[PDB]
Amino acid sequence: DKLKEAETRAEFAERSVTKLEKSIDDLEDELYAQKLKYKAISEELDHALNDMTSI
Amino acid sequence: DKLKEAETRAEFAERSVTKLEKSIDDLEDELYAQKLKYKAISEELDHALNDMTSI
Amino acid sequence: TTALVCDNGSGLVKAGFAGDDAPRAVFPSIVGRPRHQGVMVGMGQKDSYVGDEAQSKRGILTLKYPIEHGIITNWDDMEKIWHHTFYNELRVAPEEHPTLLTEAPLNPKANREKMTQIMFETFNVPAMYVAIQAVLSLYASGRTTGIVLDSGDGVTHNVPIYEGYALPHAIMRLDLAGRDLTDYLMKILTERGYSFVTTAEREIVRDIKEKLCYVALDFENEMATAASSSSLEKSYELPDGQVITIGNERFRCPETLFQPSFIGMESAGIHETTYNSIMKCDIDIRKDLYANNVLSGGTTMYPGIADRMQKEITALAPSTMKIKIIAPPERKYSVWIGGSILASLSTFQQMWISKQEYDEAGPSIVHRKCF
């Protein structure tokens, strides 16, 4: 009875964590790719102004 | 009993779900903030070029 | 004194004193007269078993819900249900307690007026107030904006709210809900041989729906998988043995929510009436409504609905907006928790419809300033 409830609850519990794990790692990778994009865009005109610093 | 060996897991996935949900909520929010900042920087560059457009 | 936060609902009456976390007494709202003759003398057989008592003697009763779709169709039975709720499940006389009923949006006026007239004349409460079932569910989430989809058992309604200002022109009320899903499940079970007809066996089909059905993330792929493998067939033991095996009826019953053409309804699913309700709003509050979509009500407890709905809305919505679906674990009692919070507020303490006010203006007071 309640045993069956426990089995069902535990079995469904494992479902949510594992599926979310892949999404979490994909989010991390996409975040890092975008941050690298911005950093690459950041330093270029930064150095351009460094050259343009007082001409 | 056989109840506890699963109820242990039943409660166990609760904190798992909480951590995953708060982490993913923060991840999406900061990702969107980064995307907005990158969009702002790109628009800044392009429209700064076009506001110049020779004088 | 303390306020009574009753919540009539349609399918489960939830009640309890204001200021707690969960309703004190939750029991089905069914009133069933016996139908056979009865030969034992002096057995103490009553003429109508209401509430949770008629879910144990349902073998010889004819259960009939007194609330069809939000509206109340049988006032005597509803009065009986209220009397039971006050006197036996809470054991507090109503002469010393304010009450806070709840009502679906866009309901007939006469229903609300009769409700207040009953509460003031028969039970003789000190003061009662009627609130829309979606604003409470928004209270419980601790938000102040957001568009709430409250898919109960009687009627599914979708009230958008921004900064506390409700948008009356964007409420989309649809009459598909848990009861129609129960009937459709009972109708598709006949494709394997299991026939449930009696009004008592509708409860068994409801239990099957609650324990087994789930919402598929992608419908066609699930239909193809269930037709080749057999990894989905879950079995269930009836109240007398003779286990049954549910195949692809598992995700076809709750799929009716997203394709109301299954039960012959014309309208669009709950995935598209939310987007339509958003698009009727102004152009500057659509981002906030997109980000704060709230789910409530019992029928939104299907395993896997918070992902299907998000996928559908993301397909419909513009690609830039972020779509987030708030699905708290305490979904079923969200309306009642919100009702408790609202009744516990100090600012709200002067909005009750005091009895002297009703005596001066009649039952039509509810449509007036005291909403």
Next chain:
Amino acid sequence: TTALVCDNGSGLVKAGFAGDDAPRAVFPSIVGRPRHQGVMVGMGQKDSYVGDEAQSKRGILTLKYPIEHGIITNWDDMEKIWHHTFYNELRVAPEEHPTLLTEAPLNPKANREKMTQIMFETFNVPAMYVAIQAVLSLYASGRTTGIVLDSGDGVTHNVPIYEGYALPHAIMRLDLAGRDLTDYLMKILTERGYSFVTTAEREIVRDIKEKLCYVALDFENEMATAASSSSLEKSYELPDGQVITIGNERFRCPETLFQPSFIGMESAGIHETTYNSIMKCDIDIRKDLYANNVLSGGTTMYPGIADRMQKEITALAPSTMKIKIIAPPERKYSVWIGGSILASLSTFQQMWISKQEYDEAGPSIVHRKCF
């Protein structure tokens, strides 16, 4: 003590203490009452959001500017705007600070008298002075001659000045300004399918106008080019997604300045009212006015206007005179910078309208020697 250099304007209120470079607080001058009903209790909902607060809740408000064309049409709202400006954006009580308002030329007297009466009775300032919005813009350029075209958002006026002696018979005030350009842009956007109607969406159209529109150097060539190629179509993302693409609406919206026949106005463009304003002046100061044409005001910030205007005037003017158009990068706040400079002068310190003087002659003191 320090003086408060307020500048009512029409569209953006700019204020700050005298002696700085830029206004301290710049915020739209709109007062918007909520229009929906509001169901959340205790949310702390106010009855009117003014200033920059109503540009964030504009989804459920009905914004309405209190200044139509220079003149003030709704005195209660203007008083509310001033109260907000003094107490919340600067946080300095007006009981201890002189004020220097600004007013367009050729405005009704009653407007100015009511302004001074409010400043002396409600806010109870020590002394206030009203100055013409063009003389300040001439101060900021550091000149002492020149004809200044101050194309604000409410009204465009063109005051010629020589050697510090203003020429009152040569002021040409025209009521086409930024607001009419916003309305015309909102009206021509409908030719592609985008319909903006609500008073909140006027702000979105204003943002489109600010970020995308530009003044064409030659109108017919641009109309021909935009009708063949597609190098002009710039896209823009609404506050909810659904990007839009503006074609030849880009340079047709601000072209109305040079051809007021587009919005049905009879008068000549800003390129020809300047030449007419010059020709009314004496024959010996026309060279100096030709060489020192000054631009100011917000609406003169369109990319490419300082060349179109110079080309037009060079076409109209005699071939020998040199036409030069002063377009400082700090055009928008030019009037306020000039106001700060004027308030910081020692020679000006005895021109204020002291309160005892107002008590002796009434509000009609402003038209007297203290101008």
Next chain:
Amino acid sequence: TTALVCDNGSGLVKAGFAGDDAPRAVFPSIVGRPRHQGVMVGMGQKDSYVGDEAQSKRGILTLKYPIEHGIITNWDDMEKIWHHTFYNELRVAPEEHPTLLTEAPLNPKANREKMTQIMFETFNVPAMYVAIQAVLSLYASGRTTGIVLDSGDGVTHNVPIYEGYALPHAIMRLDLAGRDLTDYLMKILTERGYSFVTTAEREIVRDIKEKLCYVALDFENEMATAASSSSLEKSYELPDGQVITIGNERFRCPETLFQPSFIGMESAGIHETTYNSIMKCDIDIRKDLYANNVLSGGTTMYPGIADRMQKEITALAPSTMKIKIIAPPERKYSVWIGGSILASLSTFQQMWISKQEYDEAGPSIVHRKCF
């Protein structure tokens, strides 16, 4: 030969040969695919019933209008409607007849260009011309001045004209029309218990609106009277029995025209957009426009609107001017009668867009001199 005066409209397509008094064939513009399965074989079931045929089989169809607000949203269905109109309701091949379509003011260009491209490529007419729906309604009245309020079923627009010279800067187009009134009536009927949801039952609600609703002369007095007596409750028999009784829903449905805040629209009613459209005109033609206010379009057929509108405008307008509202009994077909008159003129015979001209300049010819 004779010209075909078609008039697409939105809700009723009206067509007929030029030179008559009334359109030859008037039928709703709806195209409804069947939605159920269909078991009888050989019954001759088509795939889409258009026009008046789908108002008789509407019990098993899903009717959908191809024109939303003036603009056309579904070009295939509109092509089907035109094909039906030409071949079955008039039975004249289009290869031998000029056509005169009608279009609302301020509509997207692409709609008009696609319309002319269809008429020239698919139906292959000899020559077609597109005219603004308000100038025709002014033709039919036999006037040459006046400001015409053409409140159709899709969109309400208000074009002022003087001495034959239209004023393009004073056209006020508002998107509230008969369809929104039908939806609002269907939404307020739910306050008594009657729920109409299906797209077929929208037609029943439209019939209720046409036969029962009327515009109140004074709104508050009617609201007070209907809440005390019962002299207003008129009953109506549904297509299956079960008569319904409409109370104060009678004059609340068409009141939305004068208070568009009921359906959440911000703008002002049709009583105040006419006055605003007049005030944008020049100061010397306002008396003539005041005296020659013209009503047209279907939705202006409510019993008692020509008095309410006159009372409202007289309240707004200066007391000296005389306010007169022309409301001919043939209001519904006024646009088509005017179209027939215009097509029958000899002076107009050289304004058609001849096919060789289209072949030389493409579909963009319509915006050119041949307007």
